[PDB]
RNA sequence: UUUUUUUUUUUUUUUUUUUUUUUUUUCUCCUCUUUUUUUUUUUU
């Protein structure tokens, strides 16, 4: 929690754009069809991980662009 | 006291052959309406 938040805090000092998407979920019964609709939603750990792996992911290309040239 | 005679089941067998699924019609034909076309992002 605390590593996340804080290269959160970090990679917004520079600053990113954090928007959203419309999305929903279904759920599927034995039968197979709609018991209902429901609306998802961004949750702070879906966050906490999407940073960790956007600083991962990052690294990783830094280390094959400077390891590979063209 | 009533003798004698009037044929019967066609003859034949020791002939060659080098093709081939099917088969033969039916004309031109008005697709209705918020759009440029949305798009990163993350959790499978």
Redesign the pocket.
Same mark, same amino acid.
């Given at each position: 929690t605390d590593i996340a938040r804080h290269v959160r805090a970090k990679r917004d000092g520079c600053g &990113? =754009? !954090? =928007? /959203?998407?419309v /999305?929903v979920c279904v759920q599927l019964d034995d039968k197979k069809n709609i018991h209902d609709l429901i609306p998802?939603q961004? =949750?702070e $750990?879906? !966050?906490t $991980? &999407?940073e960790c792996?956007?600083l991962a992911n990052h690294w990783v290309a830094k280390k094959i662009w400077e390891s590979f040239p063209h």
């Open positions: &990113a =754009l !954090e =928007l /959203e998407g /999305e998802k961004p =949750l $750990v879906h !966050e $991980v &999407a792996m956007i």
